[PDB]
Design a binder for this molecule. Structure first.
Ligand SMILES: O=C(O)CNC(=O)C(=O)O
Ligand SMILES: [Mg+2]
Ligand code: NI
Ligand SMILES: [Zn+2]
Length: 331
């Protein structure tokens, strides 16, 4: 069995290997990369996402989100308070202000210590979930707006044609902006490209151990667990690496830098934070190996998790017994 300790693997494809996206994902899995839940892909030196980032300041962040925490430093939830619209130029200036900028630090480990010590005492503002792309249309390799769609994968594997579309999303971050513990919708893959700016630190639980994280979360968030049998789908709960180690939960960590791709694999729980002003692009995708995870994915029916139009069909075809109840949640 390849990668039996479930370590995060780092790949350096050549320009020739970068041509065929599906084939390279399958290669990485042949080496055991999926067992970690997360892999890093460093593009060949010949590749670029676009020519420059000099002209992005007029992108609008229609609904910036202030991430307000409750709890203790290592075990907390966050809620998203909606703020007034601002441009990416306005948000970058805000991120760099004395109230929100990254503190002085020695290295990524010192900054990680500072994040876990102090996160709860501040409320950073995240420009998340913005439909769009920063890849140049002429970038032919690993262009996250030109991937094969999940609807087409389902159709190719299972024969059923379904409605829905699959497009990328932009994320503009600042120091302390936080992504809560989650798997993807319908336990899909994700791919995330850090276009510019400061790093993003990730934490991940191997897919084979995901239920250990769920059991800890039910213990640590006992009211939320009674409310919803899949409350991690709400994407609000944080648990620190120190707390995970104290409870014996297997996990790994890695820091993504500008110019690097990360891939999350089906049922790989992940969480993390941004080091300072940055911009990432991400999208969900599927392979043949996803189908069995999609069939088994948990679902939130309490009404909180509220998701895309295109998840309807995935539930309806892969999980017809759950369909009715899930759809009641969404209406
Ligand atoms: O970058 C973020 O805030 C969160 N991203 C993801 O969870 C991902 O790419 O799957
Ligand atoms: Mg612009
Ligand atoms: Ni994710
Ligand atoms: Zn729920």
């Amino acid at each position: 069995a390849q990668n039996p300790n479930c370590n995060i693997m780092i790949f350096h494809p050549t320009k020739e290997e970068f041509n065929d996206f599906d084939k390279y994902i399958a290669y990485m899995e042949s080496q055991g990369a999926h067992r970690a839940g997360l892999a890093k892909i460093i593009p060949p030196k010949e590749w670029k996402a676009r020519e420059t980032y000099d002209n992005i300041s007029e992108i609008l962040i229609a609904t910036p989100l202030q991430q307000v925490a409750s709890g203790r430093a290592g075990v907390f939830t966050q809620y998203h308070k909606k703020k007034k619209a601002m441009t990416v130029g306005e948000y970058r200036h805000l991120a760099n202000s004395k109230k929100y900028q990254t503190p002085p630090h020695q290295n990524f480990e010192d900054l990680e210590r500072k994040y876990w010590k102090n996160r709860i005492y501040n409320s950073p503002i995240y420009g998340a979930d913005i439909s769009g792309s920063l890849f140049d249309e002429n970038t032919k390799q690993w262009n996250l707006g030109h991937l094969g769609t999940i609807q087409d994968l389902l159709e190719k594997e299972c024969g059923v044609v379904i409605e829905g579309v699959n497009t990328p999303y932009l994320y503009f971050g600042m120091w302390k902006t936080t992504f809560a513990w989650h798997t993807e919708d319908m336990d899909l893959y994700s791919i995330n490209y850090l276009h510019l700016g400061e790093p993003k630190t990730w934490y991940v639980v191997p897919p084979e151990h995901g239920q250990r994280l769920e059991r800890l979360a039910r213990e640590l968030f006992p009211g939320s667990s009674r409310g919803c049998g899949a409350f991690l789908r709400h994407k609000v709960a944080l648990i620190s690496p120190t707390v995970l180690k104290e409870n014996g939960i297997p996990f790994n960590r890695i820091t993504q830098e500008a110019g690097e791709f990360m891939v999350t694999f089906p049922y790989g729980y992940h969480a993390g934070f941004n080091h300072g002003f940055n911009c990432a692009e991400a999208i969900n995708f599927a392979t043949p190996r996803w189908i069995d995870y999609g069939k088994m994915a948990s679902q939130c029916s309490c009404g909180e998790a509220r998701v895309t139009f295109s998840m309807d069909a995935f539930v309806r075809i892969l999980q017809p017994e759950r369909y009715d109840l899930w759809k009641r949640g969404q209406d």
